[model samples]
Target: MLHILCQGTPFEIGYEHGSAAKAVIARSIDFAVDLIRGKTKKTDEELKQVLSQLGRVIEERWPKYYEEIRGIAKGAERDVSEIVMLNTRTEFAYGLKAARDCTTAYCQLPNGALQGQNWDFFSATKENLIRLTIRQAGLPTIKFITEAGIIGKVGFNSAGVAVNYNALHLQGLRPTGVPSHIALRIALESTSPSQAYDRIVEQGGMAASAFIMVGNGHEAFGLEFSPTSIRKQVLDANGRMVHTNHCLLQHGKNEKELDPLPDSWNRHQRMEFLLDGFDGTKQAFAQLWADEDNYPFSICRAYEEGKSRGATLFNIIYDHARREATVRLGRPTNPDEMFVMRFDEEDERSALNA
Candidate 1:
């Protein structure tokens, strides 16, 4: 009954490519704007006022990126207003700051209505957009990271260092490590996992619920953190990492509540189940691809048939050597699937809309 739309764009390895970069950025911005204001019950006047004001603000801050936004609208063959209306339906997104120098390893999940338009509208936002992304990032940022699912929950840097995240005790919203979104954004932009880890931990802030696993291309360190504790988990040589939005490693944190994101509970329940079943002793990586609980994020469980759906797509893995990334874009109900992006390393690539 839930309509899940997922899509991924991968680029060939090379730090400076001007592939479909502008279009992707435009879509992300468009989607983000819609999410923040689209679903509101506010009248048309109110919504338009908000969008116009925010749109101008964003454009003013980054004038050069404005063309990218226009390009996204042009490619979609729609006026800016129409685009915002479409992306407003869902929420949840993580930005990656890469050593490659631009936004990378990104995933934005929107809870699309069954009656909504197809994902191509959004997926096309990035179709061939990688070329521009590489140029902007200046990191030749394309590699297929072999992570479990498609929703970019985890990824490895060019240095062989990988990063992962999961839900942890809410800890009442103060901040334990660097905010998940910021940490992720910086990680994808930066070159060193240690730097990423330090940035998030050393300069901490408040996050609703997030845990980070940093794989230094060799050793793995985990920050089992909440808004209150960054030193919660012990980082070790565990080749595998998983997170489902609830407290898995933290003891005595099962009863926390989250009004900021209530749907997170579903993820929490599934994570607990996975932790209980995952063989901590098994040091393999590919086994997780077949992990049964992998689909729990969206697939309705035995007990809750129509309550809600979790992550629509899986396949959030990044490979550094190959310079290719793979991810599932949508859930099963909304078929319209299959994808791949190749952004040749070229300068002058953009990312705002494409």
Candidate 2:
């Protein structure tokens, strides 16, 4: 995995990192272009227009996000419209991208917490995977593992607060709010778990997404959100929270869910069966994520042909107490080979911002 360490203002982060990974960033945007085109026959001009309108809305409400994307384009030698549009492709096309088939769980351990998931996506996206650690001015220092050009996907921060993402297909999608991925970025900027929770729940977005955050040591929260509503769920009596692609809360039930792809229900069922009681050790949870009881459609997902085709690109388990991320990149066949990244004082000392 490519590990990028970026520090400074949001624009500086974009310019520096964008310059550092221009080729990969370009490829990442190209991939988004194809993905969007495959679903919506929109031309490049049309894509640019979509991005322009989306960019204007973000600029008005979340100007910082707009600044970073603008810098990304300036540094990468690409049009800002294309960069914004590429990053916001999911929002522009909304349901065009099939449900994100990830298996995520949140469980309380005796003295600490275990959180993370197996990221399932088009096998092709694995090619663009990269690890980004940012210490942007005025924002929480964050370490994220995501696509090269995405502001955030999965990661934890300095406040002992960690979060994982799940895509939800719910109702009330409009072209007028924050995009889901950008919303994830906003959550990572929080200094506390409650702050993180507030942004995800209160800040409306263009599409539906589920964010699971753990903080205050043993507390875990699950919030399902759309452009118009928010549904919250916490750890069950067993201190467990599991969510696939569908909405588990009633607020989102009115919207029709059309996850034809592997049928999220199968994975949700398998997750419950395999993890009931779930001793909750980070390693144990990692092993559970690696299970292939059902093969291609198992927790450690593989490529299926038609309905959906993707693999578990990466497996990450965040140890919130230790401020470390234990990850195994590229598929989930090996646990012994997985490595752990511990964020240390040096990482904090390197912070370029107050």
Candidate 3:
């Protein structure tokens, strides 16, 4: 629900984003704190060291990201280490993973390609969600849905290339590697599908993540990634790609989750079933995601009574061909209620220019 335009150095872009979203980001940080404490049973003092070390690795390998984190801390009047820790939380996920039952679908339309996903996460974190549009001289104008302070979660650029993510449960958590969420931000800077692939895959993300990218020029790919390995998938004339939480690649299943959630498979199947015989349009894809055939555990996941399962925070359909998005906040029982926006629209001068 927040529109931000950050144009300048990497530090300035993040500073502006942090300042504009300070209140929301503060609440998000509080949510992250509770999540870490409840899941990992680790105190803030313990997490500070782990996150600080991860920040060092990121600083040496990707100085721009480090600068951005620093700027956010400065803008938000919070500890720099805490901001870095929050951004790198997904990397060393001591206890953060829950029923992250997000379903993603991609298909090639007649003249363009459409990608969409319904994000499901901790119910409390839903209030922190916002749409961030970042503009810089070197980076493409990026627009995507993310929490208050995180650099990237899922988004695309003006170059007709877009990227989305589905969280996976893998065994590795290496602080030496880049966090998967940060890789999404790095991918958003890509001008092509290949560039996005290289930025994410080559980064060697520490947690399990699936990065799906679709370009306006009839090209799309899915990468099942781990801290040390990667698996690539391509879309054919069938014009479709789908994923839930579990790994779809042969090598991806090699990891041991100890206790993997079973709903990932069912959700994946349901999404694939819906996407079959695709209609090749943005509206069709949007309508498809709104299907709630499997109610409590369905694509359009509504809140369940006394259930740990998260609600469908929002659903978004991205038109890579036009650099636009149609975002339906909360569940979309009626498609007419959804609104649309372009990636470049955030650049308009506002009264609260940062």
Candidate 4:
């Protein structure tokens, strides 16, 4: 089950002005390197050699963004294994997207964010440890962990924007474009939502991800891509959009799979139960992210079940105008353990008022 760490309604703004910045995560690079490291992959030594070369190439091409993961590892005090194990199993599927008259947003966040850099779970380093490592390595990642599944992590960007995505069941390797996370790295680096879309549509990284990415306000988008090509649609005050773990609004089939998707781990049974709680109204976004009495049952996490293959009640959220992102963090294995965090875009200034 999921938990509602926090909730609110900044409900005062309509559409905002100006464009903003963005970031993208290169997942293909991370995964390919994962195989060659001899830690996660079990390939023949020959294939291992090929993967190793690819890893280095990825590192070289994106030296500015990736070369510092090692430092992030040191800071978090986690080996690559622990890092991946802690925050990396989310199944994504495209859900139905219809631009609703809805104006609210639901968001979920991972508190483990830069905590990896501050706490260092595995080895004991120094107080300036992670920072020193970054100085020595010349690289660093954004402060937030990740909220959107494939690419959006922590979803919030410099542009006062955010996103939420579900993991679909498509195969890992797509035709030849940027994967979702890699695209996130790009998203994080973008000057605005439009630029972010341009960067996403252009790359061919070979991944299978579906996303419901949003901008500062009013402007929202959905994306579906593989190595082959990309498909995108948008929603605004005129339409209603929604997604679960399946492709509902996108035009073409996965071309690989056939079937309507459902809740992650029998999660639909639970999500539907929660849906029953939604008060039918144009403000559907409020209901989607609101903390109802049924909030606890919103997620059906899988990992804690002895086998790592299962999912977890990753996060539950409510995103809105003031650039407010409300999130609920939950881990069912320990039922008693739960927490929450809020990314307040308005906190940038602390009243040095006139």
lDDT of 3 by residue, 1-354 (tens): 776767677799789878888998899888877766666655678778867777788789889888888888778778777787677666556434442218887777678778878887767777787777777664567777788778877776766667777767666656576677777787777878888877776765545444454454567788776665677877755778887777777773456543546777788887777777556665677778777776777777767877536767788888767778788877766432466767433443321242
lDDT of 2 by residue, 1-354 (tens): 677787777788888767777777888887887777777655678657667787787788778877887777777888887777666766655644432218788777777777878888887777777777787654567888877767767877765667777766654456676677776776677777788777765665445444444454667777776666666778888777887777777774355654534557788888887778566666677778887877787778888797447778888888867777888876778632467776667556554343
The worst-scoring run of ten residues by lDDT in candidate 1 lies at 112-121
Candidate 3 vs candidate 4, TM-score winner: 3
lDDT of 2 at 313: 85
Ranking by TM-score: 2, 3, 4, 1
- Tens digits of per-residue lDDT for model 4, 1-354: 111111111110000000000011123224324433433333446433433443454356444333333333333333333222212222111211111100122222221111000000111111101100001111111223332111124345435444444454443443223435556656654546677778666654534554545454545565654444356655434233444555434444444432433333344344445445544432443233333222222243333233333333333332334443333333332322333334333322211111
Question: Per-residue alpha-carbon lDDT of model 1 for 255-328, expressed as tens digits?
Answer: 35343234345544543344446443222221233333423333211113454223333333343334333344
Candidate 3 root-mean-square deviation in Å: 4.2
Badly placed stretches (over 4 Å) of model 4 are: 1-50, 73-143, 146-152, 171-176, 204-206, 236-239, 250-254, 258-311, 316-318, 331-354
State TM-scores per candidate.
Answer: 0.47, 0.90, 0.89, 0.53
TM-score of 1: 0.47
C-alpha-based local distance difference test score of model 4: 0.34
Model 2 reaches what TM-score against the true structure? 0.90
- Off-target runs (Cα >4 Å) in candidate 1 are 1-133, 136-156, 165-180, 202-209, 222-232, 236-240, 249-256, 259-287, 290-305, 318-354
**Model number with the top TM-score:** 2
How far residue 181's Cα lies from its native spot in candidate 1, in Å, is: 3.5
